[PDB]
Paper text:
Many species of bacteria and archaea have nanocompartments, which are protein assemblies that serve as non-membranous compartments. These bacterial nanocompartments, which are also known as encapsulins, strongly resemble icosahedral viral capsids in structure, although there is little sequence conservation between these complexes. One major difference between encapsulins and viral capsids is that bacterial nanocompartments have binding sites in the interior for a specific peptide tag found on the C-terminus of cargo proteins. TmEnc natively encapsulates a ferritin-like protein with ferroxidase activity.
Author numbering:
A (entry chain A), B (entry chain A), C (entry chain A): 1 to 265
Write the structure that this text describes.
Amino acid sequence: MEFLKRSFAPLTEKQWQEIDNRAREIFKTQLYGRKFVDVEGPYGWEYAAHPLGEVEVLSDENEVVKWGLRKSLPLIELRATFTLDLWELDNLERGKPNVDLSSLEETVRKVAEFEDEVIFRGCEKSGVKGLLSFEERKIECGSTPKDLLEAIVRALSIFSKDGIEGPYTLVINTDRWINFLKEEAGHYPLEKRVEECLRGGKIITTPRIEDALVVSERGGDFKLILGQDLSIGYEDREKDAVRLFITETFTFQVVNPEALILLKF
Amino acid sequence: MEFLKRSFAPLTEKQWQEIDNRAREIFKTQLYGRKFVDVEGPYGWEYAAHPLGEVEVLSDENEVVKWGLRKSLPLIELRATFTLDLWELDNLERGKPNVDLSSLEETVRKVAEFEDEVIFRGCEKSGVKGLLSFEERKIECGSTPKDLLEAIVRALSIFSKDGIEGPYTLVINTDRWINFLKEEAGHYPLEKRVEECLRGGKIITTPRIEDALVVSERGGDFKLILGQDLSIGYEDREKDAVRLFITETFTFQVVNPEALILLKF
Amino acid sequence: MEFLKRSFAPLTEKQWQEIDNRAREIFKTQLYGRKFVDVEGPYGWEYAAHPLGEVEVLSDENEVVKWGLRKSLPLIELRATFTLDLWELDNLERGKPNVDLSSLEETVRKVAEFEDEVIFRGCEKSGVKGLLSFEERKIECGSTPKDLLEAIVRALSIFSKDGIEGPYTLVINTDRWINFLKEEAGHYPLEKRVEECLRGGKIITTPRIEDALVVSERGGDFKLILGQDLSIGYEDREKDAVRLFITETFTFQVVNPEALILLKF
Ligand SMILES: Cc1cc2nc3c(=O)[nH]c(=O)nc-3n(C[C@H](O)[C@H](O)[C@H](O)COP(=O)(O)O)c2cc1C
Ligand SMILES: Cc1cc2nc3c(=O)[nH]c(=O)nc-3n(C[C@H](O)[C@H](O)[C@H](O)COP(=O)(O)O)c2cc1C
Ligand SMILES: Cc1cc2nc3c(=O)[nH]c(=O)nc-3n(C[C@H](O)[C@H](O)[C@H](O)COP(=O)(O)O)c2cc1C
C-alpha cells in the first residue's frame, strides 16, 4: 500500500494498470516453486521473523536461572529497480496498444529466478534449507524412459512406507523431459504413462532444476512464508524516465521432508 | 478408553493429537491385509474368543451322557512399547511444526508387519491359518507379462466354476510388479491390460508377499475379527521420556477359500 | 496454560493457590523495573521475536536483485526449578496456616533479579541494551543532599530541551537514599523537597543500581516485551518432593533514550 509511494509517480491510473498487468502475467508462469508449495500469509510489511519453536540454551550448566533465546527464520526483503521511458508510456494515452515494457519484463524474470533459487537451493545466510539439499531423500535409477517410470513407482512405495498420501506431482527439468519424449519412438504418449504411474498426478516442467523430483501435494509439508507479496513501487524520476522497483518479503521452510523424493538420472 | 491410562501421561491434548495423527497416517497405508479383507467388530476390550461352531467330542463311545467342548479361536493381544523424549514434544507448544516422532514411526511399522504376518502366513499357536497356506488354491503359469494376464483369465474361470462373483482384486509383490512393467517395453500400459482382464478390478502392490494372488471382494470370505482396534496408551515416565504402547486384540479366519487363488511365478 | 503441566503435579487446588499467591506477593515488590517501564503483551508462548523495523543489506553493490534480512530482537526464555517437600505441603490440608515455602521464595528472588539485570544492565548475547549503558545521558553534580536537588532541577531542564513532558520519577539506590536522609540533620523532610523538585513526581528506591536516574513516565519510551508472563509449572516428582519451575519469555527495548537521565554521584 502507501509505503510503495505509487501515487507520487507521474503516471495515470491506466498506465499503472498496464505495468501491473504485465508483471502479473509473467510472475504467474515463472514462479515455478509456487506451483506446488503451500503459501502462507501475507502477514504484512512489518512481519520480520517466523518462529521455529525451539530454544537455544545459553546459560552455564550450573546456573540457578537457566536461559536461552527463542529461534526464528528472518524474512528476506528483496528490491529490484528498473527504469521506464516516460514518453513511451505516454503513447498509451494516445491509444497505442503495445508500449515497450522490456525493462519491466527483464527485471520480473530476475526476481522470479531469485525466489526459486531460495526454494530449490536454499540460502545459507538466512538459514533456509532448499529442496535439493535433502540428499537422504535421493534415489537413482538411470537415464531411460523406462528408468523414469520405474523410479516413479518406487517413489510412491517409499511414500507409502512413511504414510504420505497423495496427490503426487513430478517436477522435471524441461530439456530432460524433451529428451525422454524423443526416445519414446512413436508410441503411447509418455505423458499418459507418467500420469498413470503417479496415480492421476501432475507434471510440472521447469528450468529451475537439472534432474527431477516427486512431491506430495497433500498440504502442510512445504511452506512459503510471505510478509509482503510481490509489489511494484516508485523511487524517483530521472528526466524522461521513472525509476520503479519490485519488492517482497518472504522465507521458506521444508516442514516434512518425507513428502519429497529426489530423482538422480 | 479409560483402560489405556491416557489421561495420566504428562501430555497436553495437542500433543496427544499429534501422536495419534501420525500413527493413523502410517497404519492407513501399511496395514495391507485390511485393504481387501472384511473387518468385523470392534467387540470391545473384554472379547476373548470367536466361536467356530463345532464340538470336539471327548466322551467314550459307550457313555449314556455323551459330551464334548465347544471350539473357538482365541484372540491375540499384542503390546508394543516405545519411548518419546518429553522436551522434544514440548517444542510443539512453542510452535514447532515437525517434532521428532521416529520412535513412534518405527514401532507402528513393526505392529503393522505383525498383523499382516498373521493374515498372510497364519499363527500356529493361535490356530489361525493364513492366506498363503491354502496350497490347493495354487496355479502356475510362468514369469512373463503374458503369463500374468493369462493366469488372471484362468483364475476368473476357476472362480466361475465355484460360483464366486466379483469384483476381483490382484495382490502382487511390489518388486515383481516393477519387473513386469520393465519387460513391457513401451506399449499400452500394463496396468490397463490387467484391470481389463480383472473385468474392472483393482491392483494392490505390497511387500508382504513374494508372488501374487487373486481374491474376490464380494464380501464374507475373509474375516478379520477385532476386539480392540489399534490404540495408543501410557505405561510410565522414565525421566525426560514417556513410555507409551500400541495395542490391539484380534484374530483372522478364511471362511471361504474358494474366493482365493494363489499365483506361483 | 496446559503447557505448564500443572494438572499432573500431585497437589490440591488449595495447595496450588498457596504457591501462586506467595510468588505473586514477592514478584510485586521485587520486580523493580516493572515499576516504571511500559509492559507490552503478553503475546503468548509461541512469540519468538520482536521486529526492529530495519533491514540489514547483504547483497553485493552491483546486483540486479538487491536483498537483505529483516532484523528483530529474539525473546529470552528463562527457566528456574525448585523443589518443595510434599509432606510439608500436605499440612495445609490439616489446617496449617504457615507451610514452609523457603525454596519457592529463594527462587522467585533469583528470577526477579535476573529480569532486572536485563532491564538495567542489558544482555549482549540477546542484543538488549540496558538503561545504564546510555552514557551520553549522564550528568554529574556531587554527593550531597543539595547536589541531588540541583541535579534534579537540571535534569528537568534537559528534558524540556528535548520536549519530554512528565510526570517524572527518581530511581535511586536504597543505601544512597538513606545516607542522604542522615545528612539532612533534622529539617524539612528531604522526601518532600525531592517530590517538589520533580514537580509532583515519585521516588522509587531500589538495590538494583548503585547511583540514581530520572525518567519520564509519559509512556512509550521504555518497553518490556512479554511473550509469557511469569508462571509456575510442574516438572516431575522425586520421592517426598515435587520439582516445580518458574518461567517467562521477554525482551526489552529503550525506544527513546531522551526520556532518561543518569545521575553520577
Ligand atoms: C532491500 C533494500 C531496500 C531498500 N529500501 C529503501 C526505502 O525504503 N526507501 C529509500 O529511500 N531507499 C531504499 N533502498 C535504497 C535505494 O534508494 C533504492 O531503494 C534501490 O532499490 C537500491 O537497491 P536496488 O536498486 O537494487 O533495488 C533499499 C535498498 C535495498 C537493497
Ligand atoms: C500382551 C502384554 C500385555 C500387557 N498388559 C499390561 C497391563 O495391562 N498393565 C501393566 O501394568 N503391565 C502390562 N504388561 C507388562 C509391561 O508392564 C508392559 O505392558 C510392556 O508392554 C511389556 O511388553 P512390551 O514392552 O513388549 O509391549 C503387558 C505385557 C504384554 C506382553
Ligand atoms: C530454558 C529451558 C527450557 C526448558 N524446557 C523444557 C521443556 O519444555 N520440557 C522438558 O521436558 N525439559 C525442559 N528443559 C530441561 C529440564 O528438563 C528442566 O526443564 C529444567 O528446568 C532445566 O533447567 P532449570 O532447572 O535451570 O530450570 C528446559 C531447560 C531450559 C534451560
